[PDB]
Amino acid sequence: AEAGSRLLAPLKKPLIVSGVLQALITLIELAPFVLLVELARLLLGGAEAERLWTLGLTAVSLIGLGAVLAAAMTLWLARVDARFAHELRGRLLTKLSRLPLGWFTRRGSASTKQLVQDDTLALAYLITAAIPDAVAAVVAPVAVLVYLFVADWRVALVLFIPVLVYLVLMSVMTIQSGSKIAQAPRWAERMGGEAGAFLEGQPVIRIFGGAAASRFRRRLDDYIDFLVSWQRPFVGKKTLMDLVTRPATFLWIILVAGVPLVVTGRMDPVNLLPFLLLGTTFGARLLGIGYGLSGIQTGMLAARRIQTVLDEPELVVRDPGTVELDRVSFEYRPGVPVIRDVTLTLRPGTVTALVGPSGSGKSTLAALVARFHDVTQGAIRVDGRDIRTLTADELYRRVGFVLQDAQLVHGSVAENIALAEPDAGLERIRTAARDAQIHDRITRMPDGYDSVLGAGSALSGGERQRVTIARAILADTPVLVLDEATAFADPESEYLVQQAINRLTRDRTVLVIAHRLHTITHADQIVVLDDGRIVEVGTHDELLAAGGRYRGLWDSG
Amino acid sequence: IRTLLRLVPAEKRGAVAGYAVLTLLSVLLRAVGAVLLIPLLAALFSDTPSDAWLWLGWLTAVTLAGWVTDTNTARLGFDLGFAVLSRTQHDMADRLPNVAMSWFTPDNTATARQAIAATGPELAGLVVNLLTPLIGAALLPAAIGVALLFVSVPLGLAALAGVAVLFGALALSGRLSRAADKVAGETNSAFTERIIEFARTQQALRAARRVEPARSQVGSALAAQHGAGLRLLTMQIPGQVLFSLAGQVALIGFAGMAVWLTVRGQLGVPEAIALIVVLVRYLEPFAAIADLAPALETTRATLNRIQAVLDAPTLPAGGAAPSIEFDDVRFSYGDEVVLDGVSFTLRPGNTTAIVGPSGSGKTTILSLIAGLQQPASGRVLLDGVDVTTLDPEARRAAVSVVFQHPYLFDGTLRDNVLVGDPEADPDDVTAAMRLARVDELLDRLPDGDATVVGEGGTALSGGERQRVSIARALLKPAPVLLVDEATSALDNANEAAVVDALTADPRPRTRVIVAHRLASIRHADRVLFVEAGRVVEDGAIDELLAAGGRFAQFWAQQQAASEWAIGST
Ligand SMILES: Nc1ncnc2c1ncn2[C@@H]1O[C@H](COP(=O)(O)OP(=O)(O)O)[C@@H](O)[C@H]1O
Ligand SMILES: Nc1ncnc2c1ncn2[C@@H]1O[C@H](COP(=O)(O)OP(=O)(O)O)[C@@H](O)[C@H]1O
Questions:
Q1: DSSP A343
Q2: What angle do CA A414, A415, A419 make, to 5 degrees?
Q3: CATH of the structural domain B324-563, one choice from 3.90.79.10, 3.40.50.300, 1.10.10.10, 3.40.50.700
């Protein structure tokens, strides 16, 4: 709960002043209805035209004053929101350069676009719109209620008769189906999933059909049956709950309660006039408080998400390409091991390979060496230095990596190859590109090496992968962490990517996330993992002679 | 509005008439109730308040008639809401299976998912929550304006002409308010797009030791843009302030007009006060509509989604191994052409491989043959019969496909396989399971083929899912089988299952396979090499390799690609 209020800590003073101005503006907006009551009292008293003129000028000036304040609040509140949002975007920018690099491959969490674009926009609506709208929605009924009680406390109480009947019928309607209100969000979530499945499995339903076609239809009918059975019995409650709050019902209660008072001399007829003006729509004002407070809740959830991102842990710094893993264990979630008691020594110049079934934790152990996450227990050392003690400039100058889903920065090809070292000349870049088997397609482009790249490009998966392999080659990292899935990501470009990786892997320590065991026969050290635990370690022929789990995997190939 | 009328079923076209006439009756009763304040209040403020009893008697009689018509319109509102819910959802669920597969783009799929899932509780309460308040508030200022004509013609003209001005203010306020939201959303999206790029390329930047220069560059760009954009602010009145100002000015204008008449002697003081109250009853509905601006905006959006789905284009419509003929076939996903004059004839009873570089148009051919899509130009024929002219049942039974994605659904593994032909006997399932090499998977599962393979069931690997999908296609008795290869990298048994499906099936039918590796096309009778949406090379395996063409080079690359080892050649 405190996460939302902690983000908006510096906006305590602007938001308080904004709420005070909106309270002031709403009262100024209700002032004309007070002046009409004074106008009627002037007319009944036979006041001279001079007093009628001053009252008319007072009303016109308040309308002008309210318009000016609402315009002045909007401009000032926009400037406050524009300065805070710029501060926040600067903070999000600095946090994205300090979060652990595995945070961008999360599971079961909001995307970066939602946290940066949508949530920052929800905060802007919160500061500029939802809070002033909520303050007006709460102050208008309270100001009206106090004025109508000052005018007369007897006809003010009978305004609550329709209100109590609404709350009583709302309470009866709520307890009577309290289970179903809790089920209804889960029915919506289920149907969102089933609608996605129906849209996803469309081709099967076209050519095969059968049980698949009627599965979604029958479950759709169940949902519609749930809605109809849930809401149909509450027609009587909901209709009667709506007529009591209508202005026509309030007008009758006001007049049937005021006319007996006025006719019998128990009321001054000008004291009924405030109720006729403002008190008729009093029921619809109380129902607007809920929508006013809904805006605060929606914005505060967004403030909840943004502060949660800003509260994440970061990469702390402590204190021939050899790599030492020593008693390493790792938890993605607390108390859920994924790596347990793994020990390895990637000797300099040797190609070490990780092998195992899906979910064995092989991919995580490569992510740990590049420091996508910090090991919860144990240590990983590179050239005798624990990777925790290394800065990002020091670590990634020693431990490069080419993992799956490679990325291209906005810029020309020359920068993309020379991203690691922009000072490299075009001769050095060209040799690196030819080393990665991409120089052919680069010349095939119309602009040559000046071809622009970015979030969207015509290059296929294999082509941009070889561009990234060209970047890694020119990075010159003695240690390398490689994912074998980069090879068969583009089967039609498989051989070219293999040649690039073959050129990349030479006189460099290598870690391989192996998926096809036939590509592994000449690796210097095989590692077999299942459920996060190293099972066997040794060369290809030696482990086959042992005949352990590795030979079972090979027979399973 | 035309889309909402289209949702009405033929059953409730009568009840909508009852709803409409009772809504007008409700608006007339409220207008008569508001104008009855003219004599009621004019007598209440007079020398003798006791003359107010008669007009309170008429007011309460109008009020009770108001409640009777209001509950009837609410009852018809709930009935129409449920009927509209069942009608639209069922008509929307029946529409989509007939929709051409080109329509299901990611954005179009998003609207279709929204229209199906998120419109449940909304459509049930559309007419009661939105239309009844909206119509009552819209017609009541004009109803009061017309009714005041019978009290005073210039008065009714002035109050009726003020309806046009005040609705004009609502329209202008809506335009300014929505334009402001458009600008607020777009400027924020302009600020933050650089941050999304910074977060996207973080692995590239961090690994390349350029994260801090890139962070400073983005920080400088944000600072300059905000410094330029902050000074452009100017003191603008928002949309809501414009309308509320228009309401107050109308209030003071009418009150000033009433007082001016009183000073001129054209009205009495009690009647002037009564007109002040009635001309607050007249302004009040305009504020009621302004509260429905958010609800009306969302409802307009969802009705646009439902209109989009219900307006989706539908495919037209009318056991030996058929021949598949392509004649001048051109097909495009909008403007993106994928096939350019492709033409070939698959010999009946033979297996034809389809191969080519990544991209190309390989998968589009099988989707055209199976009837998932219809060609933009040219024709696809089965034994000289156009696929589009086939009857729906004939087209369903014509073709069997193994898709790139298995598309397994929630259910038992045997149920996942029985959808090919539920009339098949258990031995047919066993044979199709054997050829698909799923019997090896049944040895792993606890309950065998009865095991659930859904999202909440069992987590099958990629190869196992494909072998279930191959079991679907082999079980079906369709005279055509299509294959679109996709396997897990390790599962060689999946390739063995595909080989058995091509070869070990005794059923006589034409076979087509889009292939990626040599293990399957080696058994094929002929190959079509497709590049850039055209068949750049065509021939048999022996014919193509003897020619030493593009397919031979592809054959050499893949054979080499099946033999490498890291740390060696
Ligand atoms: N996107 C993700 N975010 C966080 N944790 C994940 C994610 N994907 C998988 N995991 C966890 O990490 C482990 C990775 O499994 P692993 O065997 O290394 O992958 P692969 O099957 O590709 O080799 C899984 O067992 C799972 O518990
Ligand atoms: N849903 C879609 N919307 C638009 N274009 C598509 C869609 N699906 C595929 N395409 C187009 O089809 C082309 C790929 O052809 P395809 O037959 O799928 O070959 P492959 O099987 O190698 O992917 C791409 O260039 C792509 O633009």
A1: E
A2: 130
A3: 3.40.50.300
Count CA atoms closer than 13 A to B350's CA, side-chain side.
13
The Cα B413–Cα B446 span in angstroms is 12
Contact flag B358-A280 (C-beta cutoff 8 Å)? no
The contacts found for A449-456 with CB under 8 angstroms, 24 or more apart, are A449/A412, A449/A413, A449/A414, A450/A412, A450/A413, A450/A414, A451/A412, A451/A413, A452/A411, A452/A412, A453/A408, A453/A409, A453/A410, A453/A411, A453/A412, A453/A413, A453/A416, A454/A408, A454/A409, A454/A410, A454/A411, A455/A410, A455/B197, A455/B200
**Cα distances (angstroms) measured from residue B391 to each of B386, B396, B420:** 11, 9, 19
> How far is CA A80 from its chain centroid?
24
DSSP string of B238-250, one letter each residue: -HHHHHHHHHHHH
Please tell me the distance from the alpha carbon of residue B447 to that of residue B415, in angstroms, as a whole number: 13
> What is the spatial distance between Cα B93 and Cα B253, in angstroms, rounded to a whole number?
54
CATH topology of domain B12-308: ABC transporter transmembrane region fold (1.20.1560)
Q: Which fold has domain A1-152+284-314?
A: ABC transporter transmembrane region fold (1.20.1560)
Give this entry's resolution in angstroms: 3.2
Q: Where in chain A is the domain with CATH 3.40.50.300?
A: 323-556
SS3 A538: strand
Contact criterion met (CB below 8 Å) for B292 and B128? no
CATH of domain A323-556: 3.40.50.300
Give, as one character, the DSSP assignment of residue B149. G
Q: How far is residue A29 from each of residues A60, A278, A358, B290, B509, measured CA to CA in Å? A: 11, 12, 67, 16, 80
Q: Which atom of ligand 1 is nearest to the CA of A359?
A: 17
Q: How far, in Å, are A81, A89, A291, B184 from residue A123 at the CA level?
A: 9, 12, 17, 12
Per-residue buried b or exposed e for A486-511, using 16+ beta carbons within 10 Å of the residue's own CB: bbbbbbbbbbbbbbbbbbbbeebbbb
Q: CATH 1.20.1560.10 spans which residues of chain A?
A: 1-152+284-314
Distance of CA B363 to the CA centre of its chain: 25
Measured between beta carbons, the chain B residues lying within 8 angstroms of A281 are 284, 287
Mark yes or no for CB contact B184/A124 under 8 Å: yes
Tokens 């190859």: give the residue: A417
Domain boundaries, chain B: 12-308, 324-563
Out of A75, A124, A255, the one facing B233 most closely (by C-beta) is: A75
Q: Classify A337 as helix, strand or coil.
A: strand
Apex CA A538: angle with CA A537 and CA A539, to 5°?
145
Find where tokens 């339903």 sit: A205
Tokens standing for residue B351: 């297996």
Which experimental approach was used here? cryo-EM
Q: Is the Cβ–Cβ distance between B187 and B180 less than 8 Å? A: no
Element (H, E) at B379: strand B377-382
Q: How far is CA A446 from the centre of its chain?
A: 40
One-letter amino acid of B523 = H
Residue listed under structure tokens 């602010």? B233
Task: Among B330, B360, B366, B369, name the best residue to mutate to test ligand 2's pocket (greatest count of ligand atoms within 8 A of Cβ).
Answer: B360
What kind and span of H or E run contains A529?
A: strand A525-530
Tokens of A284: 């619809």
**Residue A217: which of B74, B93, B273 has the nearest Cβ?**
B93
Work out whether strand B385-386 and strand B377-382 pair parallel, antiparallel, or are unpaired: antiparallel
Which numbered ligand comes closest to the C-alpha of B368?
2
Nearest CA in chain A to B137: A247
Please report, in range form, the residues annotated as the binding site of A for ATP.
356-363
Question: Which ligand ends up closest to the CA of A404?
Answer: 1
Contact B4, B81 (CB under 8 A): no
